[PDB]
């Protein structure tokens, strides 16, 4: 029956909650009190890449950690050479409304989505000079909030239709649609082994899927509002999710429950991006108070502030080798810090 | 020093010049956001003005390049992508004026108008609302009074009084007054006049923006 099914689901959820609570003897803060703090870390703006003439809503560092692709609403996504500030490509967009960006691990392709609901995949290493649209993946009922490259052949996209998809680029059709969310899937993040990713949606919950078969392996709650961004602890067994209630948490996959939360009283503004350092100790977080607060993902004590942006920081990314962190804000300037 | 990096910097400067030219020629194009209310004759006015996700109806009028952004065909959390539309020179609106008895529908349209006219993002962008289906609205009101859609209405059940009441109520919803004047039109004349109204209202919006930036208001 509908009522009996609903109450059975409710008691099953209560069992989930009590089981996960019983498997929590000491919080991360107590265990991490002994280790000394990271102190204060001051990182200057080594570079300020200024080519965009409108807001920039996303970027992604290259695998080599030198090329970063950044997409603005002026109809362009630019492939900056962060070391020298040069732009190696200025790809125009069929639809100027772009809300995501991705740079393929091999570096050949890039991808960008947006309000058009179409993830356009551009090919860079083409023997023609100009960047050509390798594919235009379509099939999402809503906008694309975040698309990430699994390989040069598979791309996982998160849309506003409350579902994720695993497009096979060659055939340009979904090979697996991840359902289970109840709101706009605002952000996505792949594992270091790329064997399973997570998606954070507007229903205030982050889901751990498994790309192989496409089922939500785990579900994490705790946030009181949207989840605007997620990243993994480089270990691949814990992920930190931003939110619109000015709080980024740290869930762990093995224990399958929230570990701790990074909320500071004088911040009332929603997150927009989250990232880790290559060591996973310090946690970047792009607040829309025009600056990103570098936390310490073992004690919650804030470790710094990279306040150098005129407008909201909408995209953030730590290089693969951890040598720099690039933050891009709605003022059209994205800055590299080190 | 810069063995062939000189050529790379030259390429960077070339595409930077291209970006600057594109930005300059895109700043001279007025961007309008067309919301509507669903089944509100958005397609009709789109076709008249022309002379999946969102459809951009780029067109030109009197050497002015309008870029009209129709986001009606998108069902999701509006607040998440609405902030993408800061700086749109105007926010066209559509109201199925004949849809006063439909169901209540105009009440949902009013709720949508209040939500989108008071968003923190659109605190300055003026709204150009068209009350479509004027003739059909006249016939419907002739058939039945307007009190069905508004129990508080107290006036003649004629086209003039009812249209004035609806126009007043739709101009009453913008709480953030004195910063965004909204222009109301009755898009039912099957002639090349709606685009003319959009043009002579966007020119007013541009003049207001210019004299605000220039420091004259």
């Amino acid at each position: 029956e509908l009522d009996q099914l609903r109450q059975e689901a409710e008691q099953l959820k209560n069992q989930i909650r009590d089981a996960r609570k019983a498997c929590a003897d000491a919080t991360l803060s107590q265990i991490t009190n002994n280790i000394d703090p990271v102190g204060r870390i001051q990182m200057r703006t080594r570079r300020t890449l200024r080519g965009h003439l409108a807001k920039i809503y996303a970027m992604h560092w290259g695998t080599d950690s030198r090329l970063l692709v950044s997409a603005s609403q002026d109809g362009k996504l630019i492939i900056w050479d962060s070391y020298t500030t040069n732009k190696v490509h200025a790809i125009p967009l069929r639809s100027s409304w772009v809300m995501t960006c991705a740079y393929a691990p091999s570096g050949n392709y890039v991808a960008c989505g947006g309000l058009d609901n179409i993830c356009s995949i551009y090919n860079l290493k083409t023997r023609e000079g100009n960047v050509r649209v390798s594919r235009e993946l379509a099939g999402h009922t809503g906008y694309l909030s975040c698309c990430r490259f699994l390989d040069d052949n598979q791309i996982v996209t998160s849309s506003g239709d409350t579902t994720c998809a695993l497009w096979d680029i060659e055939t340009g059709q979904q090979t697996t649609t991840f359902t289970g969310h109840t709101g706009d899937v605002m952000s996505l993040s792949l594992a270091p082994d790329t064997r399973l990713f997570v998606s954070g949606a507007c229903d205030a919950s982050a889901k751990l899927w498994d790309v192989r078969e496409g089922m939500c392996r785990q579900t994490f709650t705790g946030h009181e509002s949207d989840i605007n961004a997620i990243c993994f602890f480089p270990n691949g067994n814990a992920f930190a999710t931003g939110s619109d209630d000015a709080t980024c948490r740290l869930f762990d996959l093995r224990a399958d429950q929230e570990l701790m939360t990074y909320s500071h009283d004088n911040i009332i503004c929603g997150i927009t991006s989250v990232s880790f350092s290559k060591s996973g100790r310090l946690l970047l977080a792009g607040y829309d108070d025009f600056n990103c607060n570098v936390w310490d993902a073992l004690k919650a004590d804030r470790a710094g502030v990279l306040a150098g942006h005129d407008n909201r920081v909408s995209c953030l990314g730590v290089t693969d080798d951890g040598m720099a962190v690039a933050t891009g804000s709605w003022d059209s300037f994205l800055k590299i810090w080190n | 020093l810069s063995a062939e990096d000189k050529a790379a910097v030259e390429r960077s400067k070339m595409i930077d010049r291209n970006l600057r030219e594109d930005g300059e020629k895109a700043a001279r194009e007025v961007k309008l956001l067309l919301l509507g209310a669903g089944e509100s004759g958005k397609s009709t006015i789109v076709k008249q003005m022309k002379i999946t996700g969102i459809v951009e109806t780029h067109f030109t009028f009197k050497d002015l390049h309008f870029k009209m952004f129709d986001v009606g065909g998108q069902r999701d959390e509006r607040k998440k992508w609405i902030h993408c539309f800061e700086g749109v020179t105007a926010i066209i609106f559509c109201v199925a004026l004949s849809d006063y008895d439909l169901v209540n529908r105009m009440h949902e349209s009013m709720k949508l108008f209040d939500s989108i006219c008071n968003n923190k993002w659109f605190t300055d962008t003026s709204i150009i609302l068209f009350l479509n289906k004027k003739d059909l609205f006249e016939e419907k009101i002739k058939k039945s009074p307007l009190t069905i859609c508004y129990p508080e209405y107290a006036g003649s059940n004629t086209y003039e009084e009812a249209a004035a009441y609806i126009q007043c109520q739709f101009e009453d919803l913008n709480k953030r007054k004195d910063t965004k004047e909204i222009y109301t039109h009755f898009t039912c004349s099957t002639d090349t006049k709606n685009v003319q109204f959009v043009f002579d209202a966007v020119t007013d919006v541009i003049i207001k923006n210019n004299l605000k930036d220039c420091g004259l208001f």
Epitope: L67, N86, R127, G129 | A3, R11, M14
Partner: single-chain antibody, 232 residues
Framework: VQLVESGGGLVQPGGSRKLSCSAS????????MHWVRQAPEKGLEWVAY????????YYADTVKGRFTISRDDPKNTLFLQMTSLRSEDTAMYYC??????????????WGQGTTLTVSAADIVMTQATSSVPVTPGESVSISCRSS???????????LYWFLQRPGQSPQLLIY???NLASGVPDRFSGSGSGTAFTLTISRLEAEDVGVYYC?????????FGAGTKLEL
């Protein structure tokens, strides 16, 4: 991608001539273009260069002023107007594509050449050997000894290896001394260090016999090598 060249004739010495390079397939506007000549018996030799948009132009010291090089993107053509043709310019001229961005493949595509007969501070780069006996299957090596160290301060060591099969247009094999041009078998490898470089061929096939030219790109003029011809 295709480059077709025309304008080769028996020009009287001291005269004038024009050489046209028509480009099809690729976005000729974004591609810088070099003109590289080759004497009937000698090795390659740089002639002229235009960047993208004609912003920068360079000429070899031996044709400076005499040869004026221009381009027209809308017509997709590259012109070389050359005047006062001494007997030393009786060379076939190749039209070489080149795109300069981080991780690019400059000099990747070469034109087909135009036979052109005329009636009667640099970086010297030496080739240790000019002719070696090669068995079809035995690995071989070729050495290129520069004079000025080519290991630029920013890691890049600009040294390209080109292959010219008999009766064909030379093609790019390796760029920056350790890479592979698209469509080149992995058998080719590049190694060494600044001022001494090596190209190794493993499991040599019958399609590799030819002349291997060593080039540098540290600074113009881009003095080529003397060529190390292989044989069966």
């Amino acid at each position: 991608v295709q480059l077709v060249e025309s304008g080769g004739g028996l020009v009287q010495p001291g005269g004038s001539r024009k050489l046209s390079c028509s480009a099809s397939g690729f976005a000729f506007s974004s591609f810088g273009m070099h003109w590289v000549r080759q004497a009937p018996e000698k090795g390659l030799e740089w002639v002229a260069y235009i960047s993208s948009g004609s912003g920068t132009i360079y000429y070899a010291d031996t044709v400076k002023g005499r040869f004026t090089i221009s381009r027209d993107d809308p017509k997709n053509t590259l012109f070389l107007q050359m005047t006062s043709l001494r007997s030393e310019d009786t060379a076939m001229y190749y039209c070489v594509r080149s795109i300069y961005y981080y991780g690019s493949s400059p000099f990747d595509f070469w034109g087909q050449g135009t036979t052109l007969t005329v009636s009667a501070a640099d970086i010297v780069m030496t080739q240790a050997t000019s002719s070696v006996p090669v068995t079809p299957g035995e690995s071989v090596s070729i050495s290129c000894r520069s004079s000025k160290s080519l290991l630029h301060s920013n890691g890049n060591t600009y040294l390209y290896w080109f292959l010219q099969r008999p009766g064909q247009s030379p093609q790019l094999l390796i760029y920056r001394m350790s890479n592979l041009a698209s469509g080149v078998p992995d058998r080719f490898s590049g190694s060494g260090s600044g001022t001494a470089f090596t190209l190794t061929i493993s499991r040599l096939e019958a399609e590799d016999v030819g002349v291997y030219y060593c080039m540098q790109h540290l600074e113009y003029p881009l003095t080529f090598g003397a060529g190390t011809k292989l044989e069966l």
